[PDB]
Amino acid sequence: ARRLYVGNIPFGITEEAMMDFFNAQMRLGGLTQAPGNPVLAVQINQDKNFAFLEFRSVDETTQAMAFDGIIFQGQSLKIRRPHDYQPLPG
């Protein structure tokens, strides 16, 4: 999926801030060196106010949770796992 969920995000912001907000951190050590960026589609959601980050190549969808919270528009955040793999049965 390569898609991650974010929480505690200030909806309203465009798809640029968040977008450049997640990859700008992936470019730190230099996880990507091409004519473009890693994340590709990070649309936001209204209501409870949350966002998603779509990576068409970034191989951090698993560690991206590392930014869980980090700092966006001066406000804590909350990344989640939109995969729900292995449904604990019982």
Architecture of domain 1-90: 2-Layer Sandwich (3.30)
Query: Rounded to 5, what percent of the chain is helix, strand, coil?
Result: 15, 20, 65
Q: What is the spatial distance between Cα 19 and Cα 5, in angstroms, rounded to a whole number?
A: 13
Buried b (16+ CB within 10 A) or exposed e, 42-62: bebeeeeebbbbbbeebebbe
Q: C-alpha distances in angstroms, 5 versus 19, 32, 80, 85?
A: 13, 21, 5, 15
Q: What is the spatial distance between Cα 85 and Cα 50, in angstroms, rounded to a whole number?
A: 21
The technique is NMR
